Amino acid sequence: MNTVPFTSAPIEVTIGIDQYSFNVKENQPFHGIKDIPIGHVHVIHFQHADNSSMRYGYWFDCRMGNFYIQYDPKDGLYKMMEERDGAKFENIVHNFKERQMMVSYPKIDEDDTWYNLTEFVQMDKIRKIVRKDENQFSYVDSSMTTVQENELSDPAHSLNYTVINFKSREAIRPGHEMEDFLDKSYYLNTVMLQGIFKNSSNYFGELQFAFLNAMFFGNYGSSLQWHAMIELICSSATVPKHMLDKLDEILYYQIKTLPEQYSDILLNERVWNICLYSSFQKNSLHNTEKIMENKYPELL
Amino acid sequence: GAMNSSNYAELFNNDIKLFVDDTNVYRVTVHKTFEGNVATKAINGCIFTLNPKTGHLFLKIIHTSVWAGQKRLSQLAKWKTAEEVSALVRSLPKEEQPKQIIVTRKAMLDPLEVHMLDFPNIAIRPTELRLPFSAAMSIDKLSDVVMKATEPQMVLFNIYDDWLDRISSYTAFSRLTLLLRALKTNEESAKMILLSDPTITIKSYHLWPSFTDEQWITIESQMRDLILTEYGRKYNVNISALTQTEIKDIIL
Ligand SMILES: COc1ccccc1NC(=O)CCCCC(=O)O
Ligand SMILES: COc1ccccc1NC(=O)CCCCC(=O)O
Ligand SMILES: COc1ccccc1NC(=O)CCCCC(=O)O
Ligand SMILES: COc1ccccc1NC(=O)CCCCC(=O)O
């Protein structure tokens, strides 16, 4: 298990770590999070108590370095930093553990939720979507726009998701206009999977990362990308049969984790009704259909 | 955006534009079969592509062979329309290509947009106008060329005859829409109005009769009366009791 110590907590804040959230009071003796499961990416996120504007946070993997959080009173936020002095880091963590000033990551034993939400998410792919090469961790916030949004504005502060546009020359072969618009299989299999993502694991990883940024940061561009990547598969007549099976599992756990009171803002009615009831794959997502119909029948 | 009851005069400015109407592309008769089922039989159709400023009509005849062995014909017809309009644009010199294409039915928007992706500067727009271009097949010379076709064919017409020698394109378009609306509403009565007088004829190179200016005023009045008469018959309304403002609104 690994640890993200905090220098201190000078401002009252809600700290989320993966699907869990907790509150820290102003100047409380809080010094970080321990027992973080090794083997997955993680996200540590923040919403200030006195200013719920800007959720922000950091994607990281404790296998890539020793990371800690320190508040910056000039920029007004909790910043992630890397400690290169390993013995210093161990000494700090040991002291804070001894004084019981760190909360414990509470991975319950039966629970595969985080694995199920991040199965295909890799830190190396995150760092290509979020470009800041001097850090091993990646900052995301509520307001960051995507490259596609910036085309329809600071490029250095954008989410470089793969652009998906159903009415683009990329998606439509000359001479195959009706075929390619009504059946997205060319665009999914040749353009995206063979050409850009190279395989279904990378595609699924970006889809999962987009969902998590939409849910944890309330990021609009992320929510658009997640829905577009679902609709591209569902609107293709020809999809690798296992790929539909893996998608059903991915979506099932995303819908299970989504907060019910955020269903109005995180779920697009048009897309979900098309995918579940009209699309080529309307019968291929049995688990996701059942959870959607039982948890959010109003959307449908 | 859409072309409604605010942008009327835009139709007659100097930016090249075309209306596209697909109503008559896929045309069928419906009949009982020997076993008592129902079957369709396709008949030749046409795409109606019109420049409203100049009157130039690009009538692409859709021969029934294009449907042979195809499925989902009502869907295919929209994509075939879009393919043919795209091919028309590509066939025109750059200085003759439209800057806007206005589709009469919103279901044509996506097919045409997808076929025209290589022309990002040509705007594809719908319209809130209820234009009666479906009645084009009530014009005898247009119907004749469509029904006689034995293969795909494009035929060029000026739907305004020589009217622009005497009237503006605004007035010519208004006259055309009044004539087509009357033909759509009561085809037999409209044709009787247009042909009642033997002494006025249709030139070999025209679609409509050679009316003088004053005769056109009379004809237009008779067409408005036809439309009002049919409105009264349909809705069980006493048209004689109606005021001029009420009559003008109904015709509009
Ligand atoms: C201070 O609490 C925390 C601090 C840091 C991380 C997680 C927590 N959460 C808990 O201890 C309760 C989990 C409740 C969710 C469930 O029952 O599945
Ligand atoms: C922009 O922040 C967001 C972040 C994540 C999801 C949604 C939004 N925003 C909106 O949806 C605003 C336009 C539609 C509003 C609505 O009806 O929901
Ligand atoms: C500019 O013409 C138009 C432009 C756009 C839409 C419609 C029109 N015309 C008409 O509807 C003509 C019938 C009513 C006029 C009459 O009875 O003389
Ligand atoms: C078929 O008439 C219609 C159909 C649809 C809408 C309106 C109408 N017209 C009327 O309501 C006129 C009064 C009718 C008086 C009467 O009943 O004889």
Tokens of A49: 């108590």
The two tokens of residue B180 are: 């087509």
Contact B53, B17 (CB under 8 A): yes
Query: Would you say how long chain A is, in residues?
Result: 300
**Quick one: B128 and B191 in the same domain?**
no
The number of domains in chain B is 2
Residue closest via CA to ligand 4's atom 6 equals B235
- Closest ligand by atom to B12 CA: 3
Per-residue exposure over B81-95, b if at least 16 CB sit within 10 Å of its own CB, e if not: bbbbbbebbeeeeee
Q: Which tokens sit at A199?
A: 């395989």
Contacts of A178 in chain B (CB under 8 A): 76, 79, 111, 114
Query: Quick check: B104 and B131 in contact, CB under 8 A?
Result: yes
Same domain, B142 and B222: no
Order of strands, sheet of A138-141, starting from the edge strand that comes earlier in the sequence: A20-24, A13-17, A42-48, A51-60, A138-141
Q: Which residues of A touch B79 (CB under 8 A)?
A: 177-178
Q: Which residues contact B226 (CB under 8 A, 6 or more apart)?
A: B182, B185, B186, B189, B190, B193
- What CATH code is carried by the domain that includes residue B198? 1.20.80.40
Q: Are residues B69 and B191 in the same domain?
A: no
Please report where in the chains the tokens 């009002």 appear, as a residue. B228
Same domain, residue pair B102 and B175: no
The answer to whether A29 and A6 are in contact (CB under 8 A) is no
What is the nearest CA distance from B114 to chain A, expressed in angstroms? 6
Distance (Å, rounded) from C-alpha B116 to C-alpha B101? Answer: 10
Q: Specify the residue for token string 């059903």.
A: A248
Measured from the Cβ of residue A193, the count of other Cβ atoms closer than 10 Å reads 20
Q: Are B142 and B182 in the same domain? A: no
CA A28 to ligand 3 center in whole angstroms? 76
The Cα A250–Cα A120 span in angstroms is: 10
Asked if residues A50 and A131 have their Cβ atoms less than 8 Å apart, the reply is no
Based on the domain organization, do B71 and B93 belong to the same domain?
yes
Residue B34 lies in a domain: yes
Identify the domain containing residue B155 by its residue range: 9-164
- Which atom of ligand 1 lies closest to the CA of A108? 18
Let me know whether B195 and B226 are in one domain. Answer: yes
Q: How far apart are CA A185 and CA A277, in angstroms?
A: 19
Last residue of a domain, one of B114, B131, B164: B164
Q: Do the chains contact at A172 and B82, CB–CB below 8 Å?
A: no
Q: How does strand B38-43 pair with strand B153-158?
A: unpaired
Q: Whose CA is nearest to atom 3 of ligand 4?
A: B235
Do A164 and A197 form a contact (C-beta atoms < 8 A)?
no
Residue showing tokens 């955006």: B1
B163: nearest Cα among B204, B96, B216: B216
B29 Cα to chain A: minimum distance (Å):
26
Residues A231 and A29: their CA atoms lie apart, in Å, by 47
HSE value, Cβ hemisphere, 13 Å, CA-based, for A167: 11
Q: Between chains, do A181 and B110 touch, taking CB under 8 Å as contact?
A: yes
What does DSSP say about strands A51-60 and A138-141: parallel, antiparallel, or unpaired? antiparallel
- Quickly tell me which residue has 């002494």 as its tokens: B199
For ligand 1, pick from A1, A22, A102 the residue to mutate: most ligand atoms within 8 Å of CB: A22
Inform me whether the C-beta atom of residue A171 falls under 8 Å from chain B C-beta atoms. Answer: no
Residue B4 lies in a domain: no
Q: How far is B110 from chain A (nearest CA, A)?
A: 9
By the 10 Å C-beta count (0-12 exposed, 13-18 middle, 19+ buried), B128 is classed as exposed
CA B93 to chain centroid: 24
Distance CA A114, CA A39 (A): 11
Task: Classify residue B3: in a domain, yes or no.
Answer: no
Question: d(Cα A264, Cα A296) in Å, to the nearest integer?
Answer: 10
CA distance linking residue A139 with residue A144, whole number of Å: 10
Q: Please state, as a whole number, how many other Cβ atoms lie within 10 Å of the Cβ of residue B246.
A: 13
Q: Do residues B128 and B237 both lie within one domain?
A: no
Given the structure tokens 């990416």, which residue do they identify? A41
CA distance B61 to B229: 34
Q: Does A166 touch chain B (CB under 8 A)?
A: no
The two three-digit tokens of residue A46, written as one number:
């923040």
d(CA B206, CA B157): 9
Q: In this structure, is residue B2 part of a structural domain? A: no
B194 inside domain: yes
Q: What is the CATH number of domain A116-299?
A: 1.25.40.550
Ligand 1 neighbours (beta carbon < 6 A): A 17, 20, 22, 103, 105-106
B224 neighbors B178 (Cβ within 8 angstroms): yes
Distance A222 CA to ligand 2 centre (A): 11
Q: Which structure tokens are listed for B247?
A: 């009559």
Which one of the ligands is nearest to B180 CA?
Answer: 3
For residue A177, which residues of chain B lie inside 8 Å, CB to CB? 79, 82-83, 111, 114-115
Question: Ligand 4 pocket: which of B235, B239, B242 to mutate (most atoms <8 Å of CB)?
Answer: B235
Q: Identify whether B125 is part of a domain.
A: yes
Q: Measure the CA–CA gap between B205 and B196, rounded to whole angstroms.
A: 20
* Closest approach atom of ligand 4 to CA B234: 1
Q: Would the CB atoms of A177 and B76 count as touching at under 8 Å?
A: no
Residues B136 and B234 occupy one common structural domain: no
- B60-72 exposure pattern, b = at least 16 Cβ within 10 A, e = fewer: bbbbeebbeeeee
* Residue to test with chain A: of B110, B114, B119, most A Cβ within 10 A: B114
**Residue B107 belongs to some domain of the structure:** yes
> How many other C-beta atoms are found inside a 10 Å radius of the C-beta of residue B181?
19
Q: Give the amino acid at B231.
A: Y
Beta-carbon-side half-sphere exposure of residue A177 (alpha carbons within 13 Å): 21
Q: What is the 3-state secondary structure (H, E, C) of chain A?
A: CEEEEECCCCCCEEEEECCEEEEECCCCCCCEEEEECCCCCEEEEEEECCEEEEEEEEEECHHHCCEEEEEECCCCEEEEEECCCHHHHHHHHHHHHHCCCCEECCCCCCCCHHHHHHCCCCHHHHHHHECCCCCCCEEEECCCCEHHHHHCCCHHHCECCCCCCCCCCCCCCCCCHHHHHHCCHHHHHHHHHHHHHCCHHHHHHHHHHHHHHHHHHCCHHHHHHHHHHHHHHHCCCCCCHHHHHHHHHHHHHHHHHCCHHHHHHHCCHHHHHHHHHHCCCCCCCHHHHHHHHHHCHHHC
Same domain, B160 and B170: no
Q: Has residue B18 been placed in a domain?
A: yes
Paired tokens of A27: 């100047």
A293 reaches B (C-beta below 8 A): no
Three state DSSP letters for chain B: CCECCCCCHHHHCCCCEEEEECCCCCEEEEEECCCCCEEEEEECEEEEEECCCCCEEEEEEECHHHHCCCCCHHHHHHHHHHHHHHHHHHHCCHHHCCCEEEECCHHHHHHHHHHCCCCCCCEEECECCCCCHHHHHHCHHHHHHHHHCCCCEEEEEECCCCHHHCCCHHHHHHHHHHHHHHHHHCHHHHHHHHHCCCCCCCCCCCCCCCCCHHHHHHHHHHHHHHHHHHHHHHHCCCHHHCCHHHHHHHHC
- How far is it, in rounded angstroms, from Cα B71 to Cα A183? 15
What resolution in angstroms does the PDB record give? 1.3
Interface of B with A (CB under 8 A): 76, 79, 82-83, 110-111, 113-115, 117-118
- Distance in angstroms (rounded) separating the CA atoms of residues A92 and A85: 11
> Is residue B34 within 6 Å of ligand 4 at its C-beta?
no
From A174, which residue of chain B is nearest by alpha-carbon distance?
B115
Q: What angle do the packed helices B244-251 and B213-235 form, to 10 degrees?
A: 90
- Residues B55 and B160 occupy one common structural domain: yes
A76 CB-near residues (< 8 Å, 6+ apart):
none
Is there a contact between B174 and B131 (Cβ–Cβ < 8 Å)? Answer: no
At B13, which CATH number? 3.30.420.230
The answer on B147 and B45 residing in a single domain is yes
Residue of B nearest to A178 (CA): B79
Interface contact flag, A177 B115, Cβ < 8 Å: yes
